[PDB]
Amino acid sequence: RLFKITALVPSLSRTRTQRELQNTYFTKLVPYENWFREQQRIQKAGGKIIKVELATGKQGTNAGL
Amino acid sequence: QRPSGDQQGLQLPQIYFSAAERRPKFVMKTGLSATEKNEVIKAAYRQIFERDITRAYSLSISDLESKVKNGDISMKEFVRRLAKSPLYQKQFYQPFINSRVIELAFRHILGRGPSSREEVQKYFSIISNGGLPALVDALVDSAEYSDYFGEETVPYLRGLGQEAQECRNWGPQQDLFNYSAPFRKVPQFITTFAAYDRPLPDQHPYGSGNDPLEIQFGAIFPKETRNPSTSPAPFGKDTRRILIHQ
Amino acid sequence: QDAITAVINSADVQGKYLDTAALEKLKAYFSTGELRVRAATTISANAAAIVKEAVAKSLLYSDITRPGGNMYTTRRYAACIRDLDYYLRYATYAMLAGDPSILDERVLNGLKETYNSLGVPVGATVQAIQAIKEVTASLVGADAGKEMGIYLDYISSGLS
Amino acid sequence: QDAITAVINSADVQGKYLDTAALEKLKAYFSTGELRVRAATTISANAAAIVKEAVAKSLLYSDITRPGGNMYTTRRYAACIRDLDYYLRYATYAMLAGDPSILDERVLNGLKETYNSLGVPVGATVQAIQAIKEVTASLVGADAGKEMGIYLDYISSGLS
Amino acid sequence: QDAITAVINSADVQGKYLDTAALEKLKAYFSTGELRVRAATTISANAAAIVKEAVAKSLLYSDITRPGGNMYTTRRYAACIRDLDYYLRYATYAMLAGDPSILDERVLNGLKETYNSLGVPVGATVQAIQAIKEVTASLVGADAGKEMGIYLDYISSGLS
Amino acid sequence: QDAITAVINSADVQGKYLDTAALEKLKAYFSTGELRVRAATTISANAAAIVKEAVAKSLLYSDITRPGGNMYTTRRYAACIRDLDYYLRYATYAMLAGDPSILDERVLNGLKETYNSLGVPVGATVQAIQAIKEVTASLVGADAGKEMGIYLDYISSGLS
Amino acid sequence: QDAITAVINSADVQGKYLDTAALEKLKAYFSTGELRVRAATTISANAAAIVKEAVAKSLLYSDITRPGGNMYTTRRYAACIRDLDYYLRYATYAMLAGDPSILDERVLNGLKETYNSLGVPVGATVQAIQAIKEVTASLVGADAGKEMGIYLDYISSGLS
Amino acid sequence: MRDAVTSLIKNYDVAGRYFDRNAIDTLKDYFDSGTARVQAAAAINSNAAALVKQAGSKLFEELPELIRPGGNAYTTRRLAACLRDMDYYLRYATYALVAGNTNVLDERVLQGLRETYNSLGVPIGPTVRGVQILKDLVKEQVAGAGIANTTFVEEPFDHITRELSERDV
Amino acid sequence: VVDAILDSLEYTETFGEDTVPYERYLTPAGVALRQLRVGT
Amino acid sequence: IVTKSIVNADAEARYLSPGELDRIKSFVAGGQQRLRIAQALTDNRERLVKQAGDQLFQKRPDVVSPGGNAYGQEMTATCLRDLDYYLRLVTYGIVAGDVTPIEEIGVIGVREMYKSLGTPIEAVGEGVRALKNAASTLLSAEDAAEAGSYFDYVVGALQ
Amino acid sequence: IVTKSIVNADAEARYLSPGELDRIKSFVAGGQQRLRIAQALTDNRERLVKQAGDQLFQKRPDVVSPGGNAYGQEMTATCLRDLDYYLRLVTYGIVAGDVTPIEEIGVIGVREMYKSLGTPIEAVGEGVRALKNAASTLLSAEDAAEAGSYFDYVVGALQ
Amino acid sequence: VKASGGSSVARPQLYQTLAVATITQAEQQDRFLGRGELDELASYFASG
Ligand SMILES: *[C@H](C)[C@H]1/C(=C/c2[nH]c(/C=C3N=C(/C=C4\NC(=O)C(CC)=C4C)C(C)=C\3CCC(=O)O)c(CCC(=O)O)c2C)NC(=O)[C@@H]1C
Ligand SMILES: *[C@H](C)[C@H]1/C(=C/c2[nH]c(/C=C3N=C(/C=C4\NC(=O)C(CC)=C4C)C(C)=C\3CCC(=O)O)c(CCC(=O)O)c2C)NC(=O)[C@@H]1C
Ligand SMILES: CCC1=C(C)/C(=C/C2=NC(=C\c3[nH]c(/C=C4\NC(=O)[C@H](C)[C@H]4CC)c(C)c3CCC(=O)O)/C(CCC(=O)O)=C2C)NC1=O
Ligand SMILES: CCC1=C(C)/C(=C/C2=NC(=C\c3[nH]c(/C=C4\NC(=O)[C@H](C)[C@H]4CC)c(C)c3CCC(=O)O)/C(CCC(=O)O)=C2C)NC1=O
Numbered sequence A: 001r002l003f004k005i006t007a008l009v010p011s012l013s014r015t016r017t018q019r020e021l022q023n024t025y026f027t028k029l030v031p032y033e034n035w036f037r038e039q040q041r042i043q044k045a046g047g048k049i050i051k052v053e054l055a056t057g058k059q060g061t062n063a064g065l
Numbered sequence B: 001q002r003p004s005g006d007q008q009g010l011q012l013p014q015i016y017f018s019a020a021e022r023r024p025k026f027v028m029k030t031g032l033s034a035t036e037k038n039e040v041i042k043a044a045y046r047q048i049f050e051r052d053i054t055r056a057y058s059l060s061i062s063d064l065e066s067k068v069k070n071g072d073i074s075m076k077e078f079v080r081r082l083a084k085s086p087l088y089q090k091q092f093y094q095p096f097i098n099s100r101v102i103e104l105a106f107r108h109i110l111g112r113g114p115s116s117r118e119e120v121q122k123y124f125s126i127i128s129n130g131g132l133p134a135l136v137d138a139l140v141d142s143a144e145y146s147d148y149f150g151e152e153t154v155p156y157l158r159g160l161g162q163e164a165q166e167c168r169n170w171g172p173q174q175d176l177f178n179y180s181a182p183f184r185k186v187p188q189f190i191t192t193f194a195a196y197d198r199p200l201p202d203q204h205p206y207g208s209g210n211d212p213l214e215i216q217f218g219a220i221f222p223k224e225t226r227n228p229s230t231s232p233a234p235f236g237k238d239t240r241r242i243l244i245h246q
Numbered sequence C, D, E, F, G: 001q002d003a004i005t006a007v008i009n010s011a012d013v014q015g016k017y018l019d020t021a022a023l024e025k026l027k028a029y030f031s032t033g034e035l036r037v038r039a040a041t042t043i044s045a046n047a048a049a050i051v052k053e054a055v056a057k058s059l060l061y062s063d064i065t066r067p068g069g070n071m072y073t074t075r076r077y078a079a080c081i082r083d084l085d086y087y088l089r090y091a092t093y094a095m096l097a098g099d100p101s102i103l104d105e106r107v108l109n110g111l112k113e114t115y116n117s118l119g120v121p122v123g124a125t126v127q128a129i130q131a132i133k134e135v136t137a138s139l140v141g142a143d144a145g146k147e148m149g150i151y152l153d154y155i156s157s158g159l160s
Numbered sequence H: 001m002r003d004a005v006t007s008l009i010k011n012y013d014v015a016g017r018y019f020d021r022n023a024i025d026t027l028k029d030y031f032d033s034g035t036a037r038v039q040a041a042a043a044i045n046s047n048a049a050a051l052v053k054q055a056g057s058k059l060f061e062e063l064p065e066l067i068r069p070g071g072n073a074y075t076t077r078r079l080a081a082c083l084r085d086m087d088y089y090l091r092y093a094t095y096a097l098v099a100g101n102t103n104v105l106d107e108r109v110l111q112g113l114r115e116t117y118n119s120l121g122v123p124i125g126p127t128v129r130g131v132q133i134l135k136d137l138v139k140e141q142v143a144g145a146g147i148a149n150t151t152f153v154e155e156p157f158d159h160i161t162r163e164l165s166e167r168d169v
Numbered sequence I: 001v002v003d004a005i006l007d008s009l010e011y012t013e014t015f016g017e018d019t020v021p022y023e024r025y026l027t028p029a030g031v032a033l034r035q036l037r038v039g040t
Numbered sequence J, K: 001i002v003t004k005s006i007v008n009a010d011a012e013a014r015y016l017s018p019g020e021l022d023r024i025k026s027f028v029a030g031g032q033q034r035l036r037i038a039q040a041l042t043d044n045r046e047r048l049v050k051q052a053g054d055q056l057f058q059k060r061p062d063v064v065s066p067g068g069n070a071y072g073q074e075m076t077a078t079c080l081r082d083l084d085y086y087l088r089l090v091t092y093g094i095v096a097g098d099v100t101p102i103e104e105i106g107v108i109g110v111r112e113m114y115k116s117l118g119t120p121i122e123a124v125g126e127g128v129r130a131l132k133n134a135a136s137t138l139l140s141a142e143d144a145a146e147a148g149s150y151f152d153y154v155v156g157a158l159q
Numbered sequence L: 001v002k003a004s005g006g007s008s009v010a011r012p013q014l015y016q017t018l019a020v021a022t023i024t025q026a027e028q029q030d031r032f033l034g035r036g037e038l039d040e041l042a043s044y045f046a047s048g
């Protein structure tokens, strides 16, 4: 059970740390019980969540994931 | 500006950072040329296992390279799927006690050593209730990871030139950033951090390696060299040890 | 390591093939594996009851849980339960492997360093592991309780 | 070390001469030395009565002096009286010096190691030092009992 | 400690008088002391022959006495004979006391530390103690050889 | 560090300008850099052949690659090849820098600790580095083989 | 150990007789022993002058001998002279033996433990040993100063 | 890290007893000292950046070798590090001023200080010397804006001294 | 070192002139490993 | 509450922001009322434990029942000692002004402790609620509000 | 060699350090000799493949033998086509000045390809050695050194 | 301070130098220096 998420997290603190200023827009797969804290961490930075999509998993199935 | 309780906030001046050994910082970018992906993959191997597992032993997961080269899973996902793996467990989770496993997984993922006593208390509770995959998930997802490596930057060491350093863990972090770090086997961080609040120990004043065993023959000391177990505490000159008196 | 892996290693470092004494050792292990598995199952049944009975036997209503003792604070009581669950779980692993090397590799490596750093009392820990051993030897029977008590006494002897 | 010697050391490691804040510290010590000496005299008067009253307050008629407790054997009772006399005497020395460094150097150095080696209960020791502190604060007055209780609580806090 | 002293201690820490179970234990010890003394005499007869037969059974003509092995140097062969004589002598003391506490107090205290410091092979030591046990159980008879093998297996189990 | 950076540092910590002796040192380095670069190129040519010839000279067909030796397991043979490639590569870096400080900073820092922890034989490593030095001094010539052997003997002397 | 004793040991642990490479090593040692003995004599001549010149080069007129530094107290200055005399004397022993094992066995064993316990600065010690090495390489000549600087740099590298 | 109110709570918690009169006496002491402590901390916070510069100026007035060849504040690369250490000592002294203890200075500053300073070759004598240029200046600034009794401003710098102290008596 | 250990007063007064020396004190860790093991 | 602001500004590299200095000055002002509330809860402890045991054993009789944990005089004495401990930690939190030195000693690992002791946590929460009711009857309105603050924190923590 | 320095300084946040600019200027200076060497190897390709097949099939006759892979005219034509490919990649590496555009097309996955084709890799290494010998005979001394550079890289890579 | 930890020495660079930096780039990817990482120092030692 994996999700395909596109998201965008600006740190808002690169100007006082002088970091690499790398890209903040990604399309990644995340597993089932992991997307929970990923959701939460992306919302911690005020990040926009563009689109959540099912990669792996049939919904409504109970045994066998 | 660290986002926590017990960690302190520091500032390194901008002059000091420029005059230091700069390190290559391998971002993924999933479109560049054929070698420039393998360089990033070799860097992930060189930093996560402290020596490159291929070209040296030639055994690695060839399943996950075929997804990182494409762009199915990002680097923050790849480090996570590489740590909770059967390959990493045979070298770093199986030899060491859990309190040493925590510090080595701090070096492999966060690229630093434990900053406070509260840090190792919380992360020991997490590895305790959930094995190694819970520790890997709680480490890769953090604020200190995502502010530093984002989604794509391969993790990298941060000594005394890259970022500002604190005094309190300076000694143990100096020995953690080494090739000879996964041989101590004795947790250098929880022992020092909880010896800070407590008074002195009963060890010999000239280091802990001076205390012989007492089994009728002696001539036996913990070598400084065989397995480190280094714990020097500052004794004064008017001390007196406490003795049991048979 | 296993008992199987230890026998294979001891035959390997000589370059020796599997002679009849090693086959005797492996066949004795394959005989004892029945009660090994049954003992591991019933210890995995009620580990929390074993730890509860052990602290009620040894550590409770002492000065250790009183203020001034090392188990006074409630996070320290939770850490005590965690350490006893660790001792029981790794003793179960060493019982099913039939070789105490995992106790030496994963538990007894830097443990006296930690317990002398934190000021943890060692003798009360030894008595708690002793109460663990008595409770699980009562619970599993004498015949598997001997092998459980061997590795629990191994932890107790290495701790001291 | 002293309070005088600590002030001189803190002025010395900077290469600093004796500025007015250090002279304030030394003059405060020279003001408080009167009651320091009088308190040390009356504590040296009846130290045995203080230790007797403290064990009668805290340790006696418990399970500690019953069989199974750590003060059951009569050599262990004598060792208990010896340890309490040590705590009171070194607290008197630290009170008259005005600096707790001799407690750190001579008492609190390897004491938790010894008390966890022998199986000595730590919380009962802390409560006994507390009863010592209450008895001598009653005996000497509040004004010197504060400074006596500071070093006795220093011993109690370092012991825990 | 003795078996007598252990019975007296177990009756003492409760404050209990000598009840009938303790008198049963002491009378069983006073029954078994006959063969205990006779076994100790005939083991003290020919300890050197037992150690010689044990190294000829287990350690000789191996790679251990070849160069590269731990018994190659002649001072290391003499140290091996010394360690085996120690194991046999302290097993004799524990057999005559009827209590293995002197093995825990005088032999098995810091022995794995020493044998892992020097690089002494532990499994060859265990097999040498096993050959010692077989030779003295043949020499003394089965009835006292059981009690001799109990303490020799105690040394072997604590060593591992 | 470099030889250039060492000269600049030695002139800097005095506050001294670049006097004529430092200019002599830098001009000698700028004279020797030709053969330094040519030697580094031909050592980077065939490093695997040098390591293969060195293990065929020193370590092969001994007891070290036999069972019981430290190079018996095939992961240990691969680790041996890795360590020898490290010694040759860092000796190449120290030869081109003209200053052995990178050997002290990156190789010789905690290496005896590691080799005594793992039980790696030190004398066989020293003889392997010696065979490396002979092979590359034959391969590169005598004139650059002297400077290569200086840093390889530096690694060998710090290892012992 | 010696270079002779190291060659004999390396030939012994294989069971090997003295082959021609070992005879080459011993004959090279017997060639170099001339300047070894002459260098040891002239270093034993004026060791106090070498230590005086080294502290005048490196440690004097710094903040280390100022108050706050580690060499401020006169017993600490005497301890500094003692440590530098130790480094020079044991480097003389390692130069005449031709093997740095006595430095590892007698000096570098628990020295970082002591210097981090006392708060001794390590970098100033390394620079003092460097100044010792420069002074004795000037005093003895370049040809024996190389071998003296090898063992002094061995002490400096193991100290760091 | 323990406050002046939480350190009493630890001292009374290890004994297992309740609050008595004496702890209430020291809490009354801390609670009537707090209004003056906050004003002193605001006055030190206001002019802190210039305090660091004048502390550097008088520190180089004292020992010339600090800005000379064989010193540690030689270049600006090595000067900015000494000035930010002045910044750190002033910051944690203000932390200890509002807390009222020396446990902040113990737990966050002094605990690994010998290891870094012996590791980097950094001296200790000029460091405590600079700490006290800082506290003379801070005493002047606190005496400027109101507050008459300045001993609580005086104590945390001296505690930092006494633990950075290379004790020879 | 040997001459100063036997020259001292803490040797001559406790042991005496005709007593073989014997162990009188142990370290706290040295009694931790001794007494607290599986058979106390 | 000073350690809270200090580690709060300490995770950052900034100083203590002067709004935090304002909250420290206001807590310093309210400390006298805090000390009076703590002394009033201090001297009347045994009344509060008596009325808490009253209201609890009237509310939940299963601890009294022999299947429950607090059966017999020894177990009920341990029960009232636990309530005494929680009243003591509430007085600590009243003085400290913020719930850190009470959560550090009574909250942070309490669920697994009471789970491996056999006692239910809801009965302990009802006991602290009874303590809050008795202290609300003992104090004035502005004092009972500020005590029921920290009592409310303990009741929310034990659940 | 410009991509090497660019990604080398690009992993860092720094610019291109001017020593790298010196090496780029020196490569820019030597580019004319590189182009002449590449054209000389270009126009004489079939001679080099002929002499490489000569020296290889004289050295290893098992590819000629029917158990080997290069048996028959079709398989031996595929063999000489492989040698032609490797000569072409060597000319690419001669122009580029650094072995990246030749390793990217001929080295990076060659072992598993030749393993799942059945051919031995040592015979391919001997074929590139024969190409190096024939080009060493074809060129001058300073040209054969600089060609045997990249030929040497291929020979080390195939092993 | 009561206890301590294990210090060592720390040698940070006082300035970036060319011919340590180009050695350093090969160390951080543990390879021998490439076909132009040599060719810089080839011209550098002559232009010295
Ligand atoms: C002014 C017209 C002239 C001048 C004056 C000047 N300089 C200082 C103070 C300092 N100068 C330094 C210098 C450097 N640090 C470096 O790393 C380098 C690169 C080689 C240099 C030049 C430093 C560290 C200081 C502060 C310590 C000191 O006093 O030396 C002063 C004193 C300022 C004051 O009172 O604070 C003055 C008057 N320098 C010039 O550029 C002009 C020629
Ligand atoms: C200035 C008064 C003195 C001086 C200072 C100096 N310090 C450094 C380098 C460091 N100092 C620290 C200090 C701390 N880190 C902490 O976390 C704390 C507690 C909050 C303190 C006090 C650290 C970590 C460093 C390393 C650099 C870094 O921050 O990463 C230097 C630089 C040394 C060098 O040569 O590079 C200097 C010069 N030196 C003096 O002479 C004064 C006595
Ligand atoms: C488990 C299911 C699964 C598959 C199949 C998978 C395929 C896959 N094939 C790839 C490339 C490729 N795939 C092919 C395969 C082919 N092209 C052809 O001409 C043939 C018709 C076909 C082979 C039969 C080739 C030639 C490439 C190389 C493209 C390149 O990397 O430049 C890539 C790009 C990155 C990489 O290989 O490492 C992925 C991810 N990943 C998966 O997780
Ligand atoms: C798998 C082997 C293993 C063990 C045993 C282990 C123990 C361990 N016990 C600890 C603390 C502790 N350990 C104890 C245990 C005890 N104190 C007592 O009084 C009793 C005698 C004894 C319980 C039976 C206590 C009370 C603490 C709390 C100290 C503290 O955190 O403040 C800590 C400090 C950090 C933390 O718990 O999360 C470690 C690492 N780690 C391991 O990896």
Ligand SMILES: CCC1=C(C)/C(=C/C2=NC(=C\c3[nH]c(/C=C4\NC(=O)[C@H](C)[C@H]4CC)c(C)c3CCC(=O)O)/C(CCC(=O)O)=C2C)NC1=O
Pocket (backbone or CB within 6 Å): B215, B216, B217, B218, B219, E064, E070, E071, E075, E076, E077, E079, E080, E081, E083, E084, E086, E087, E090, E106, E107, E108, E111, E114, E118, E120, E121, E122, E124, E125, E128
């Ligand atoms: C009373 C309990 C007791 C024991 C056992 C004891 C053992 C002991 N064995 C030692 C050495 C040794 N011990 C052994 C023994 C063995 N190595 C092997 O290969 C065999 C498996 C095994 C003999 C059966 C050897 C070979 C040495 C020599 C190491 C050396 O001195 O170089 C040493 C080092 C110093 C010395 O012998 O004089 C001690 C202290 N001390 C004690 O107080």
Ligand SMILES: CCC1=C(C)/C(=C/C2=NC(=C\c3[nH]c(/C=C4\NC(=O)[C@H](C)[C@H]4CC)c(C)c3CCC(=O)O)/C(CCC(=O)O)=C2C)NC1=O
Pocket (backbone or CB within 6 Å): B051, B179, B180, F064, F070, F071, F075, F076, F077, F079, F080, F081, F083, F084, F086, F087, F090, F106, F107, F108, F111, F114, F118, F120, F121, F122, F124, F125, F128
């Ligand atoms: C750059 C400097 C440097 C060195 C040298 C280094 C060495 C090093 N050698 C190791 C193991 C090893 N090292 C050796 C090497 C040898 N044993 C012998 O018998 C020979 C005498 C010698 C080879 C010439 C062997 C056989 C192992 C395997 C031990 C094992 O992993 O089980 C290990 C343990 C983990 C691992 O290899 O991946 C390290 C860290 N690390 C460094 O950072």
Ligand SMILES: CCC1=C(C)/C(=C/C2=NC(=C\c3[nH]c(/C=C4\NC(=O)[C@H](C)[C@H]4CC)c(C)c3CCC(=O)O)/C(CCC(=O)O)=C2C)NC1=O
Pocket (backbone or CB within 6 Å): C060, C061, C062, C065, C066, C067, C072, C073, C074, J056, J063, J068, J069, J070, J071, J075, J076, J078, J079, J080, J082, J083, J085, J086, J089, J105, J106, J110, J117, J118, J119, J120, J121, J123, J124, J127
């Ligand atoms: C200050 C922090 C602190 C807490 C929280 C604490 C709890 C605590 N409660 C205990 C027992 C107990 N606790 C209770 C509790 C209750 N009675 C009930 O029915 C209700 C569920 C609840 C109270 C109204 C009971 C019945 C026991 C005895 C259980 C037993 O003996 O197994 C014990 C073991 C005996 C002891 O040593 O006192 C501890 C350590 N100790 C502490 O030091």
Ligand SMILES: CCC1=C(C)/C(=C/C2=NC(=C\c3[nH]c(/C=C4\NC(=O)[C@H](C)[C@H]4CC)c(C)c3CCC(=O)O)/C(CCC(=O)O)=C2C)NC1=O
Pocket (backbone or CB within 6 Å): K056, K063, K068, K069, K070, K071, K075, K076, K078, K079, K080, K082, K083, K085, K086, K089, K105, K106, K110, K117, K118, K119, K120, K121, K123, K124, K127
């Ligand atoms: C430019 C990068 C590149 C390489 C390296 C490459 C190799 C390559 N070699 C092949 C066959 C072959 N390669 C050889 C090779 C050899 N003859 C021998 O005996 C020697 C071992 C070796 C050469 C001297 C042979 C005999 C075949 C035919 C094997 C077959 O038909 O199964 C084939 C399959 C047939 C084809 O499509 O040409 C490929 C793709 N192709 C490429 O595009």
